[PDB]
Amino acid sequence: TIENSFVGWELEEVLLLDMSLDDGDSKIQNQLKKLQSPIILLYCTKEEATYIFEVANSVGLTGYGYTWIVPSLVAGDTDTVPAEFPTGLISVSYDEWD
Amino acid sequence: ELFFRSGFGIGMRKDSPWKQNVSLSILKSHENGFMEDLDKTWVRYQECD
Amino acid sequence: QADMIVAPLTINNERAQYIEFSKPFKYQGLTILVKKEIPRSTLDSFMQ
Amino acid sequence: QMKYYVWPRMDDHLSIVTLEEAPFVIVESVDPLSGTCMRNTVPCQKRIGYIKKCCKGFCIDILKKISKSVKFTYDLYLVTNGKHGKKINGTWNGMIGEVVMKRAYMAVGSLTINEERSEVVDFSVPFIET
Ligand SMILES: *[C@@H]1O[C@H](CO)[C@@H](O)[C@H](O)[C@H]1NC(C)=O
Numbered sequence: 001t002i003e004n005s006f007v008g009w010e011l012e013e014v015l016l017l018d019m020s021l022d023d024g025d026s027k028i029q030n031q032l033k034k035l036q037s038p039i040i041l042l043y044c045t046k047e048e049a050t051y052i053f054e055v056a057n058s059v060g061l062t063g064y065g066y067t068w069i070v071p072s073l074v075a076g077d078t079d080t081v082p083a084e085f086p087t088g089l090i091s092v093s094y095d096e097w098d
Numbered sequence: 099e100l101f102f103r104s105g106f107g108i109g110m111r112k113d114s115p116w117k118q119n120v121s122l123s124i125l126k127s128h129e130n131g132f133m134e135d136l137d138k139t140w141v142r143y144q145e146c147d
Numbered sequence: 148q149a150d151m152i153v154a155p156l157t158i159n160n161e162r163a164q165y166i167e168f169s170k171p172f173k174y175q176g177l178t179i180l181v182k183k184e185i186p187r188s189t190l191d192s193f194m195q
Numbered sequence: 196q197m198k199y200y201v202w203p204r205m206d207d208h209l210s211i212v213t214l215e216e217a218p219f220v221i222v223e224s225v226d227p228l229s230g231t232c233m234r235n236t237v238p239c240q241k242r243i244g245y246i247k248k249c250c251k252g253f254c255i256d257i258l259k260k261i262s263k264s265v266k267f268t269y270d271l272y273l274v275t276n277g278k279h280g281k282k283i284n285g286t287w288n289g290m291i292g293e294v295v296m297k298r299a300y301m302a303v304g305s306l307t308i309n310e311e312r313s314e315v316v317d318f319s320v321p322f323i324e325t
Contacts, residue, residue: 006226008234064204088204100178104159105171105321109152112167116151121169125310133172158320170308174324 012037019051028055039067046076050084062086200245207267209300211258212274212290213239216305219254222273239271248273257322258303269301279305280312291316 002009013035017028032055040061044052049070056062068086072093075081108124110117127133157175158168189195215222222239225232225247232238232249237259239250250271262269280291290306293299294316307325308318 005229006233007229007231100176102177103175103324104157105175106155106173107158107168107171109156109162109166109168111150112165114150114167117167117169122310122313124170124172125308125313127172129309171321 013040017052019048025055028052029059032056032059032061035061038065039069042068042070042074044070045073046082049074050082053084053086056086064088209267209269210298211269211271211301211303212293212299213250213254213271213302214274214278214290214304216254219252219305220250221252222248222250225249237271239273241273242275254304271303279307282311287315 002011015031015034017031018024019028042049042052053062062068063086068089070089070091072091074085075091075093078093078096108120110120152166155173156162156168158171162168213220223236232247236249236251237255239248240246241248258269258271274290274293277288277292278290280287280289286292287295290299290302290304291312294302302316306312306318308321312318
């Protein structure tokens with residue numbers, strides 16, 4: 001999309017997370033410390049999503065001035081909120097009400 | 099050709115009581131034709147072409 | 148020892164960090180002054 | 196179709212007024228293909244129900260370059276009540292008519308320093324002769 005766009009998009013911090021081995025929080029902490037953008041894209045599942053945000057609030061990314069957007073499966077259910085997500089989380093989900 | 103433009107200024111020590119009325123008794127000397135009159139009698143009399 | 152520098156004093160970023168300036172009372176610039184050479188003239192005889 | 200024309204959530208968030216002056220602040224309409232402002236222009240709103248235009252020029256490149264050094268955020272919006280300000284029996288209307296009304300907190304554009312306006316707001320250092 002970026003190549004075929006007159007509008008200017010700034011790309012940065014394209015690093016991924018290899019959350020597979022134990023005691024990776026120290027590695028995650030440096031990975032979480034390399035983000036310097038007002039909005040950060042995150043793509044995980046409902047079970048995996050809560051693990052990442054346990055470190056996100058530790059450094060202090062969550063709050064005003066920072067926005068996180070996740071796919072539909074991160075929320076999982078329309079009402080069953082695990083309360084493990086930062087205030088202001090916005091996501092796109094499949095239509096179910098109509 | 100002029101390459102560094104910055105006007106003059108009646109500097110004063112920071113945080114001085116007079117710092118506001120001086121900057122308004124200069125802006126009022128431009129409009130009345132005063133500082134265009136001192137310019138006439140001191141700086142713009144012609145002696146050589 | 149002085150409270151008001153009534154003189155031609157340019158305003159720039161180094162001085163403005165310690166003292167307070169006013170609104171400019173003259174707008175200027177920097178220009179170069181060089182000696183004017185003689186215009187000369189070549190007309191004394193019509194055999195030129 | 197978003198129900199919120201502007202995001203509700205917002206002191207580094209400053210309103211800023213501007214007006215169209217021919218060589219300084221040029222207002223060009225939004226590109227039809229994408230409906231968004233292209234490069235080199237900071238998006239600028241408009242009143243009448245809002246329409247998003249795009250602004251660029253000499254007095255805008257100052258705003259982008261200054262904002263980088265002092266690290267704040269802004270959102271321009273064109274003024275729709277008079278131009279540049281004029282005192283009509285105790286009312287100011289224009290780029291200088293909103294800063295006092297506590298709806299602007301800044302006014303970038305082609306203003307002009309003089310005594311009558313300077314009793315209401317306090318201008319910055321001049322940066323061009325006029
Ligand atoms: C500046 O002028 C105002 C106008 O009357 C006056 O009230 C004030 O005392 C003056 N201040 C100084 C420092 O001259």
